[PDB]
Amino acid sequence: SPLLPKLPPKTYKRE
């Protein structure tokens, strides 16, 4: 989400 994280699987946003 931020930058160079553990490479998580995206899903939704915050809204």
Add this chain to the structure above:
Amino acid sequence: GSRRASVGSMEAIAKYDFKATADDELSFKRGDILKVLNEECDQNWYKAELNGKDGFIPKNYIEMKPHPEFIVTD
């Protein structure tokens, strides 16, 4: 037409540092372009090889480049 004189693979610029974690992962540093031998596993990590090593690599720390012509620029 048709090309029958390639025999090799493409490359992919390693945008950052990283190392192999899984038993079949590949290691590399920031600027170590790897040789994409295939694209197995998820559609986000490629399969490549660094002058001898190889394995999956998260494309987030990489980019896909074509075949360059020689490295000597001078």
